[PDB]
Structures are given as C-alpha cells and as structure tokens.
Design an enzyme around this catalytic site. Structure first.
Site, PDB file in Angstrom:
ATOM      1  N   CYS A 238     -10.126   2.842   2.159  1.00 36.00           N
ATOM      2  CA  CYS A 238      -9.772   2.920   3.576  1.00 36.00           C
ATOM      3  C   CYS A 238     -10.988   3.394   4.357  1.00 36.00           C
ATOM      4  O   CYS A 238     -11.472   4.504   4.147  1.00 36.00           O
ATOM      5  CB  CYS A 238      -8.560   3.844   3.790  1.00 36.00           C
ATOM      6  SG  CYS A 238      -8.268   4.248   5.538  1.00 36.00           S
TER       7      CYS A 238
ATOM      8  N   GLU B 121      -1.811  -4.659   8.174  1.00 35.62           N
ATOM      9  CA  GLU B 121      -2.176  -3.971   6.939  1.00 35.62           C
ATOM     10  C   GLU B 121      -1.113  -4.037   5.863  1.00 35.62           C
ATOM     11  O   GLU B 121       0.090  -3.899   6.133  1.00 35.62           O
ATOM     12  CB  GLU B 121      -2.462  -2.487   7.192  1.00 35.62           C
ATOM     13  CG  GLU B 121      -3.666  -2.184   8.031  1.00 35.62           C
ATOM     14  CD  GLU B 121      -4.046  -0.713   7.979  1.00 35.62           C
ATOM     15  OE1 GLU B 121      -3.984  -0.073   6.903  1.00 35.62           O
ATOM     16  OE2 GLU B 121      -4.475  -0.172   9.033  1.00 35.62           O
TER      17      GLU B 121
ATOM     18  N   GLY C 181     -10.694  -3.616   7.017  1.00 30.23           N
ATOM     19  CA  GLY C 181     -10.462  -4.966   7.559  1.00 30.23           C
ATOM     20  C   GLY C 181     -11.626  -5.440   8.419  1.00 30.23           C
ATOM     21  O   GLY C 181     -12.011  -6.613   8.351  1.00 30.23           O
TER      22      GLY C 181
HETATM   23  C1  LIG Z   1      -7.085   3.168   6.366  1.00 33.95           C
HETATM   24  C2  LIG Z   1      -7.418   1.666   6.467  1.00 33.95           C
HETATM   25  N1  LIG Z   1      -6.616   1.176   7.630  1.00 33.95           N
HETATM   26  C3  LIG Z   1      -6.986   0.940   5.181  1.00 33.95           C
HETATM   27  C4  LIG Z   1      -5.747   1.545   4.511  1.00 33.95           C
HETATM   28  C5  LIG Z   1      -5.381   0.827   3.198  1.00 33.95           C
HETATM   29  C6  LIG Z   1      -4.746  -0.564   3.409  1.00 33.95           C
HETATM   30  N2  LIG Z   1      -3.496  -0.443   4.163  1.00 33.95           N
HETATM   31  C7  LIG Z   1      -4.466  -1.157   2.070  1.00 33.95           C
HETATM   32  O1  LIG Z   1      -3.295  -1.149   1.613  1.00 33.95           O
HETATM   33  O2  LIG Z   1      -5.414  -1.642   1.403  1.00 33.95           O
HETATM   34  C8  LIG Z   1      -8.876   1.374   6.789  1.00 33.95           C
HETATM   35  O3  LIG Z   1      -9.307   1.844   7.860  1.00 33.95           O
HETATM   36  O4  LIG Z   1      -9.593   0.667   6.004  1.00 33.95           O
END
Ligand SMILES: *C[C@](N)(CCC[C@H](N)C(=O)O)C(=O)O
EC number: 5.1.1.7
Length: 274
Positions: free
Chosen positions: A73, A208, A220
């Site tokens: 993340c 997500e 992302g």
């Molecule tokens: C915190 C996040 N929005 C990614 C969080 C993990 C994803 N939801 C996943 O399941 O892979 C970020 O900022 O990268």
C-alpha cells in the site's frame, strides 16, 4: 491497543505500533473496526513490526477494510514513514522495510513529503497473480456489460489498468466491482481507470480490492504509470491526479525501482480494547 489515525490524500488508515505492542486480531475484528459509524473508520489498517531481517528497520503489514491481508500500500507506506518518525520509532531519513513480498525504502524529504522506493514492477502473469497464456501489454477481460482492455502489473499487489476517455464519466461504479473479482485474477485485483492527459500527466480513479473506490490509491498510481510506460504512452516522470490530490511517479523502466512521492498526515491517536 494504542493506534494512530492518518491519511494520504484522503485514503485513511489506522496505524499500529506492533514493535512495542503485541498486535493480532481476526478478520471479523478488522471489519468491525473499519466501520465508519460503529468502529474507528478506515480504508486500511497498517502494522509496524520488528523486521525479520535484522539489517532492515521494520516489517510492514497491510489489511483492507474487508479484513483481507495484502502485501502493498503506497499511501500507507508514506503514512508509515511519517508515523515511525513522529512517534520516535526511528529518526533515519531513509527507512528500510520489508513486506510479505519485497523490500522498500521510505525517504522523509525536507519538505515533509515522503518518497517511496516501491520496488520494481512485476509483469510476469503468474506472479501478479493473473491468468494469461503469455505476457502482453494489453489483456482482454470480459464482463457482463462490456469487454475491456487492461494492462496488468503487480506492485506487490495486483492491478488492472483500463484506459478511459474521460475520468469523470468512466463507469467505475459498475466496471470496478466486475473487474475487482474478475475470474482471471485469482486473488482479486485493484481496478484502475486512467485518463491520459499528456505523456507526463494522468487522471486516475481506482476501485480497490477490499475497499472499493477510495479517495486515492498510491500503488494504483504506480501501476497506472508503469502500464502507460510499458505501452509507450507515458514518459518516465508522471503527475497522477486522484480524487484526493496528486502524486509524482518516477520509473526509468525494466530493472529499475519505481518511486512514488506525496503527502502523509497524522490526524489523532487512539486507544481501543479489541
Ligand atoms: C493503501 C492503498 N490504497 C492500497 C491498499 C491495498 C489494496 N486495497 C489491495 O488490496 O491490494 C495504496 O495507497 O496503495
């Protein structure tokens, strides 16, 4: 359990010191705590742990609001850096962390932004994981309402990046859920929708895995830029505009780590009995 609440571009986190506390819980507990009206309220929960490789500074764990544990993340990594600095777990400018997958480096910049070495993007379908006969720059994903094309990549977590003509009118609301649990992504996927403004500027929305459409997704943003570079549609340094604000992504290509720079903010501290 002591915790802190933080956000990165409105993607909000519970962050827990699991170095000086013994932190564990069930997915049911995570889901209860994620609830914004009857819990704490968060998109993700992050744990700072002692490293398994004692040459590193910390280990980093990530949980989605749905209770799932994942391995990356980006917005959280920036918050992790701010947290360990603010709370005095370290004072190093370059902080080395492990995840369930690869290592990262968190750099606390003098302007207070965090630059994260996210590692090298992963393209091999089986490692994403993603079901595909061969590596391609574009893959066909059939859904009930529309067949879409995407690039697929892992930043430690899986991404499918769909290019769209207009970010505000892209059908994130229906296509997001259909792609997030698409059969070709056996561990589910973060579905990104990217409008390319020019080779150094995109707009992005991300539905997500485990959290739905949040205000921002750092991993992302990284994935979208990596995909556009792979496709020859973007240059090596790109501004990514998400609903909650912007990130700067830098990637010099295969063999090189990808860098993500942006804000991270501490909001409050808390205590809860699980
Ligand atoms: C915190 C996040 N929005 C990614 C969080 C993990 C994803 N939801 C996943 O399941 O892979 C970020 O900022 O990268």
């Amino acid at each position: 359990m002591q915790f802190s609440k933080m956000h990165g571009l409105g993607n909000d986190f519970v962050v827990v010191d699991g170095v000086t506390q013994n932190v564990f819980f069930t997915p049911e507990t995570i889901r209860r705590l994620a609830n914004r009206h009857c819990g704490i309220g968060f998109d993700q929960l992050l744990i700072v742990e002692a490293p398994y490789d004692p040459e590193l500074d910390f280990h980093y764990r990530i949980f989605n609001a749905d209770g799932s544990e994942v391995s990356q993340c980006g917005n959280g990594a920036r918050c992790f850096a701010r947290f360990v600095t603010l709370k005095g777990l370290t004072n190093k400018k370059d902080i080395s962390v492990s995840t369930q997958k690869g290592n990262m480096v968190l750099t606390v910049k003098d302007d207070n932004q965090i630059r994260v070495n996210m590692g090298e993007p992963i393209w091999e379908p089986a490692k994403i994981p993603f079901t595909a006969n061969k590596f391609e720059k574009n893959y066909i994903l059939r859904t009930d309402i529309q067949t879409v094309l995407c690039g697929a990549v892992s930043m430690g977590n899986p991404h499918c990046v769909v290019q769209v003509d207009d970010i505000q009118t892209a059908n994130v609301e229906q296509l997001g859920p259909l792609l997030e649990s698409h059969e070709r992504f056996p561990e589910r996927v973060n579905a990104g929708f990217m409008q390319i403004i020019n080779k150094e500027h995109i707009k992005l929305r991300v539905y997500e895995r485990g959290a739905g459409e949040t205000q921002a997704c750092g991993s992302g943003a990284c994935a979208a830029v990596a995909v556009g570079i792979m496709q020859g549609l973007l240059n090596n340094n790109v501004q990514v505009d998400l609903p909650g604000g912007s990130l700067m992504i830098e990637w010099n290509g295969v063999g090189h780590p990808l860098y993500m720079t942006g804000e991270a903010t501490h909001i409050y501290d808390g205590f809860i009995t699980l």
